[PDB]
Amino acid sequence: FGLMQPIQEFKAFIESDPVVHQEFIDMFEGIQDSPRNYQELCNMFNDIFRKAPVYGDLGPPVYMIMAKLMNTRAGFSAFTRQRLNLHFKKLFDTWGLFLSSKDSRNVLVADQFDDRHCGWLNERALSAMVKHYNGRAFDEVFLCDKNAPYYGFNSYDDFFNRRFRNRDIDRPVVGGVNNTTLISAACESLSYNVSYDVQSLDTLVFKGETYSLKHLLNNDPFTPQFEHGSILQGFLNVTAYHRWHAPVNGTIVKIINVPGTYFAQAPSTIGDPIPDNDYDPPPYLKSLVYFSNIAARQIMFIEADNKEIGLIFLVFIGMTEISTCEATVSEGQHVNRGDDLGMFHFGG
């Protein structure tokens, strides 16, 4: 018994507005398993935010218990209120403090916890994390000490944001850093979508639930330069490297952090089945283009050294509890393709 203070304030907020309160009743209709009501949700949050994630689920822990709620009109309505998302930001920031602490190392173990969950140093998790590294082992790919407790990592966040030990072997800057005509992937990912001739929309309703430049870029003055342009979007799954690399030789022009959503899926998907497996995508993972427009996100404009490439943008797009976007470069700084650019964290 007893809830951490940010959760108590979250619960008070829910009960402060009758319409918000009613959404937090309706979104649970017909639900059989925990969480069955918003009190249980708060209790389960209180446990999740004092633990680190383990390996085995399709997504991180808050997503896993929110997915059914996101998949309702009442949930979507609640989760697209900026007042409520201020609380989610506070909650995930609080969890982030724990995940940066030494206490969060207790999942960086080789233990198997049950049939489907294990510590991040269990062979099942290690192998999953090096699937795309051509047979090299975790401790070859990533900077760590395989002979130290917790592989030498200081926290769950340190492990989450592990670095490459020898990127020239495992993730080379293909074509050579000095070739200014090439643009590299900023994140280790799976392709999600490519759109051409992109435009702005007045509303994010119907219309293929596609990109709207003025939404995505939060009405930046640069937005018109990208009308009729193209966008490549990637998805970083739960085992991917989660740091950002510079995509081009160029200068950081502008960095904008935009408050937004955490649990908003595309409205057209509300009610679709949530598969009970890790290979058939659930509705939220069919919504990445839609919520690129509204999720908590960071926009970064870069002026390439090669002016035939010129001004480009990156948007780092939050997903549920993994929504903190930290740039480690400053406006006006020159970067080369492949350089450290920033990273995602658990947080708001």
Binding site: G175, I183, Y192, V194, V198, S230, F235, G338, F344
Partner: protein, 35 residues
């Protein structure tokens, strides 16, 4: 999680074709657009 790379219409670097198919592996630092 996700990230988006945005290119202007006049950008001579064009997105590499294989990435238009969803689910394709994107190795960080590999080329995703080129002149």
């Amino acid at each position: 999680x996700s990230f988006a790379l945005g290119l202007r219409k006049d950008c001579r670097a064009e997105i590499v074709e294989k990435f238009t198919e969803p689910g394709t592996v994107i190795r960080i630092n590999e080329v995703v657009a080129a002149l």
